[PDB]
Swiss-Prot record, chain I:
Its EC number is 1.16.-.-. The keyword Cytoplasm applies. It catalyses: 2 Fe(2+) + H2O2 + 2 H(+) = 2 Fe(3+) + 2 H2O. This is DNA protection during starvation protein. Induction: By iron limitation and stationary growth phase. Fe cation 2 binds at residue 57. PANTHER family: GENERAL STRESS PROTEIN 20U (PTHR42932:SF1). GO terms for cellular component: cytoplasm. It is found in: Cytoplasm.
Amino acid sequence: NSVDTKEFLNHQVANLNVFTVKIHQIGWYMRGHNFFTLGEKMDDLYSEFGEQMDEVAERLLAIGGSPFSTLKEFLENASVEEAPYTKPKTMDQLMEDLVGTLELLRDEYKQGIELTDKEGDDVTNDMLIAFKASIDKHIWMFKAFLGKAPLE
Amino acid sequence: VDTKEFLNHQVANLNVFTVKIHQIGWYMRGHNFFTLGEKMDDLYSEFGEQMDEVAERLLAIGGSPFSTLKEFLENASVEEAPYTKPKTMDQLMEDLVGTLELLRDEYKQGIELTDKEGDDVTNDMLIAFKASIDKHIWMFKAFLGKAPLE
Amino acid sequence: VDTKEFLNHQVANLNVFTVKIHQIGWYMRGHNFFTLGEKMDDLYSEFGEQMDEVAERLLAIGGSPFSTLKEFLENASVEEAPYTKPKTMDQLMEDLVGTLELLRDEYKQGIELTDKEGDDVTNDMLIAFKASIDKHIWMFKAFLGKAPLE
Amino acid sequence: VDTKEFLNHQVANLNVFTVKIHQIGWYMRGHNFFTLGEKMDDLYSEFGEQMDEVAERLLAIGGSPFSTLKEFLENASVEEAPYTKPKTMDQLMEDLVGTLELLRDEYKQGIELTDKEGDDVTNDMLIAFKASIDKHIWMFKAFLGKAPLE
Amino acid sequence: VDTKEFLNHQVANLNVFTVKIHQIGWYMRGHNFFTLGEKMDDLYSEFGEQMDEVAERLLAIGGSPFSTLKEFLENASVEEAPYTKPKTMDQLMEDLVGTLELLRDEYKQGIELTDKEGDDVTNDMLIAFKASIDKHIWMFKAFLGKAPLE
Amino acid sequence: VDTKEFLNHQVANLNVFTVKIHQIGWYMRGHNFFTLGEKMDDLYSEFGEQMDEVAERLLAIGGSPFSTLKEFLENASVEEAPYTKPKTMDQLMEDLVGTLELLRDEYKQGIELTDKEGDDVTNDMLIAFKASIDKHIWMFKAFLGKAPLE
Amino acid sequence: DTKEFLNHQVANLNVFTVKIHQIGWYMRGHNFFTLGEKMDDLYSEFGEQMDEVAERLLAIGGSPFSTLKEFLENASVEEAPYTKPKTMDQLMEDLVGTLELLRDEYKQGIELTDKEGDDVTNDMLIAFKASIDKHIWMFKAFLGKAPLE
Amino acid sequence: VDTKEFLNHQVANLNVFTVKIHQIGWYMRGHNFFTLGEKMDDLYSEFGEQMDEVAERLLAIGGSPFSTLKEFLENASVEEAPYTKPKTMDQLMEDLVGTLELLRDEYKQGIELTDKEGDDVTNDMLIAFKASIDKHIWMFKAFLGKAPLE
Amino acid sequence: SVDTKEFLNHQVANLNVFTVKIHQIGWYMRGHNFFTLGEKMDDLYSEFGEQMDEVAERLLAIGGSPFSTLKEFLENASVEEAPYTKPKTMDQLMEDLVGTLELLRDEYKQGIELTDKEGDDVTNDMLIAFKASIDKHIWMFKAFLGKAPLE
Amino acid sequence: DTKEFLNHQVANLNVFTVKIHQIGWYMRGHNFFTLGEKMDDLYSEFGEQMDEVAERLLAIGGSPFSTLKEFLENASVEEAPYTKPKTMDQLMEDLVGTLELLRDEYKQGIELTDKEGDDVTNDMLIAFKASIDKHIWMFKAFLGKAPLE
Amino acid sequence: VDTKEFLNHQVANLNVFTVKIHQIGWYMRGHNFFTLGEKMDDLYSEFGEQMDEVAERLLAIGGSPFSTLKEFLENASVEEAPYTKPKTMDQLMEDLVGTLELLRDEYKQGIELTDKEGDDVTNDMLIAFKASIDKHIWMFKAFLGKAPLE
Amino acid sequence: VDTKEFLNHQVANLNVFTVKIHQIGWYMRGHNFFTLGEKMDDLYSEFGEQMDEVAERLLAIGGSPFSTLKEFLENASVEEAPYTKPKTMDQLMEDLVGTLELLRDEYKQGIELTDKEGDDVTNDMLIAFKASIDKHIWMFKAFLGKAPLE
């Protein structure tokens, strides 16, 4: 019963690429009073997660892995879900999706943290922790924006 | 194809291209690793900015940008290949140049169309991007030991 | 109108717009006070710079820019109203977008005019500005929960 | 009350205020979370600076600043309450403004006192701070949909 | 008059002044074009900031700032003249200095009034501005080969 | 005590420590006034940052930070004393070191607890902070002419 | 053709660049400092215009002149050694004259490049003429003249 | 006698003080060499800037600043002594503080005078300087192990 | 291998030899990669110099006494150095660089394990952060050499 | 020798510094802004030059003059109170005159320092003379003259 | 040849060299395109600055700098060749080094001359430049697989 | 000795010196810990830069820099001792000064030698470094209560 650090990292490269595009979807299609605040917030998320992705891929490379490097691979491997923007969505619906995705990444990183601890891959371990630190901070902030406690 | 459809097609293209830039940067080997790794980081930023600007312009003209990997793949003319076989720096750079040329030529089509449509803003935006594309084609071709239009 | 008269009209328009931006920023109330206040400061700078560049271009083409409030009022098509009755964030923003729309459309007329006259520089200048105006129309309309061309 | 006792009272007040700013930043929820979160960060720095300057000025006139939480609590007129029941953004902001108004008025008493005593430096220091407090009252009341002195 | 009425008058004045600063920058000819052009750019920023701060202070004291060109023209004591006949550097600078002297003298009245009303903040604000104005009077008069108070 | 209670306790500690740093900076006398005054400014910012991070981490895990001086005093293990008797630079520094040692030890406790709890993020955060605390312990002990663990 | 025009500008710009240095080095009078710093700015700006023109030429498959000999044989911008003392006004009139020459040639380059469908070169030249026209207004204003007088 | 006389006297003082700061930095010996050396460099800039501001203010009120070493020597109340016998850091610092106290007390006289004359600008300027002077007095006295008013 | 202090002190030694070697490579390098690699050696020198200082300061923080002389560094380093006598290619110089990075990686791995057993959490994360960088360099330098990182 | 030379410069530069301030404060005319900023730059540079001369004096076991009295009693740079109104040109001539004096004295200091084998002081003075000569050119050009006229 | 003639000769040389630098950058092909392209950009600025400094030094010594291309061609010893046949990066680099070596040797003669003339300033200026030229000679020779004096 | 031998000897010296500078920073205790720690950090950078420059200069003249600890130890005249017995800040500083003196004296010999050889670049390079060394000798000797040459 095992997925390895390589497979976990590679899965996150896929995930992050899907998330990156989803962040653009949110930024592009957002409407409402928080358009500017959230627009700039999506710009920040985009950089951060793009940087996370780059770091995850570079870490994978550093451990002898081969990162997915096509949209086809990303789609075939991501657990992060994407949907085309057909029906109009509220800022809250968009933010819920964003939060939902952050939660998925947090939980998966949590699995990656445990795995990486079990395999003795200390570097990947700290890297994932550093990222979860930020994911958790965003979960609190975006849930706060949605009028909810970070766990609900 | 109208301006909306053209721009939207470039959103798809640029997204595929951006990932391919990552592929090049990640998988590159050889003596030009550092110099080209840094050059891919710059390309990634620039083409990412291009993409965001294309999407925003599309949005500004009442369009609806493709905003999913699926849509990007369904609509892109820029091709992508999984990195299975090792490729040399020059094979990677030829693919980069090839894509830059595709983008150049498509932008050229977009420049025509957008002029025909009287969309002066989209027109200048495409021109500024082709300006950069052309410069990259020269630089990358020169790196490969070739003339820009060779 | 010729290029000079068009530019001069924009000098007027922009000056009226600039002061309307301040009106919005000063008189705004509601939850969006900070976000919108900062955005009005941004818009004031940007349009103040547009105005200065329009005036400078007008000077460069041998024109004589309007350089008084009487002249601006006498010539602008951008309307202004004293802040007497309390207005909603939405009412102020719609007046802002309405003005941006007017600028966009006038700029489009100026772009056409300047193209016919062979004034390539003024043409590109107006295009760059429209690029910005169209971006703002998308952004503020999105803020208002509307599509850009709605 | 002399200048020393007034300044020391503000050292107490500011420290209570600074913590209350954190309380607001930490516990705020709603659509204004980001805009107000950053605005609290700014207020924290500002009032922290104000506090340090007040303490430093008190030092400079031969005074002995309160420099413990117990002293702050025993001496502050600015009130604090543990965050037990959930509060709306508006409730938190009314508390903020109430505190800013308390500071304004106390500073006004300090301005008068410091004039009487001929302590010109502390006078100007307090006026510079009141300048800021008044601006903030205007801004935060505007955010609350209210006029500054209403 | 009162503090509110005074500041509102200055909002009018500063807006007329700021436009006049542009007039001067735009129409300036002679060996001093560059040095004076950049000095007008600076004056524009500073007095635009002064205007913004005066209006914000007015807001802060429960006032309602003039927010239209019409209101500025109906209320300003600062005179404006369209640029019809060519003016020398000299004539334009004399108008500039003349206007700075008007603002200094009015601010001196405003300083007096604000002191009588006990509006310490508005008082310091107007003093800070007069400090600047006086410096500019010295500088610009020196530029003109004149002593500051001649 | 769980992670939430541990963190909250540190929010209390850090707030007391923050104030104490201010006490030390304000009341310090002697030849090291400048060097240690600047070093206190640095520690104030660093520990204020640690505090805010601890509180935000606490929020991130579903906790409710102490957010009043009363709560900080009721819960901190970091002790404070009003500055009554004059203290030497060394007495102030020993108090500082003593507090840094208390924090190190408590953070060590927090690190072990947080590891047992599988709260990896809080673990790393506390480690990064202890890294800095240990460095300061070395530096201040060396200033005092002693070894770090002496 | 676009290549030839761009190449001609590489020549022109290099002559202009050196003339800007001539003006800055040899200038005298009360405007020495203001105009000295303005020459510094012009030098950088036209040096960058020059490099962009050459880079554009390269991008379209051209071969830029890359020697002083080639710049001299190909530039329409005139240069003279500084032998007789010249006034700041005479130096500035030479600068303005050169700017107008560049403007007028860029205008021809803009027409040509519009005819050839070289949209990129077209925008580039437009962007540069924008600058050139601003400079002409400024330097003419400095000279006490209207921009087109 | 008047504001002009006072400011001119300060131009003299500051010039003597500025050189004295250089004397202290150059001749300084002991463990505090670096810390005080850097502090003298800061003082030099600050008082140099004060001097420049004083002179500019004098010029702005129609005065004629002393502009020669001879004039400064003939009018300064700040004393200077050639460095003949070696002086301790303490001796040097006490002379610094002594001078700082002289400047404080003269500025105090300058504040009253300038208040009498209704020279609000000069008043604020002097108050701003006294603020800094008082802060320095506190810091330097603290460095010497003394309270500020001891 | 067994005391955190001794492990860190050994790395103070290692890093100072590595630092000098980084200079050796930058000074003596020839070939088409001179500029790119020259700049890269400058970066390595700063980073490893910083790593060295952090290691020594950490050692100080835990009550240790860092080696503070060249003789001590040379008597205790496991990083080997050779005077530049015979001309070496860019590849030979880079392989020695990579070889040294691998040595440091493996030793840091040992230090990470030890420091974990000892409950020295601070030194643990410090070593991990460094190994993160070492690993990135091994990937980059190996890639430059046309090899996979675990090559 | 070197010590006496450097100390004489500390005096000179302090007199110069104040003269730069005189010029900046009292200047009138169309060059007020450009020359006012130029005086601020000169103030910094010669202030830095002075501090470096004094620090070098210190470094060689010297004792710098550190009082206005000492500067006045030792400087060869002359100063005069501003009584009568002076033109920008008269002010600039006085500035140039002083720069010339500093140049010439540094020339002697460079000679002496070379003979005494004080290589550091030598380079320091040469670096300053570099700057002084650049300024002599610029200010003379401002005044419509050649640098050595 | 005197210092004036020597420096003037270098003004010529540097201007030829600077254009050669651009030739190399523009026409370069191969794997080293990017590394050498940025290195040419650096050399261009540096040598442009050397040129400007040399001409300013010449001016400072009462000289008259060559200030036309014709004068530079008439006077330069640095030779230039139009880019007609394709050259290898090696050929271009050898020309670069060759030119750097000529500059070095000429500077050496200028150093001797300038020392004989007692022109200490020009001497140090040339030495500083020779420092840089020598460093480049090493670096470019190293890039070509050769020792600096090979 | 020749220039190559001299430079190489300083490569060795500087590397021993740099590590001794770290020894001093690491092991220092007392009230001067912060000020001197920061000053060792600056010396470390400076002397590391000097060392790199010396090595690059040696390369530039056809030399072969020592590039191993072994070689540095074998060739350095700068002495090093492991830190076994506790040393005072004083003893550490005296060693630093002693070493700076040794470097100053050896650079002086290097300046003489390099002047005889006509290596003007190395000459100026050594002088610029001796400038710095002499300044530090003054500063650190001042710190120790001594005159530079005592």
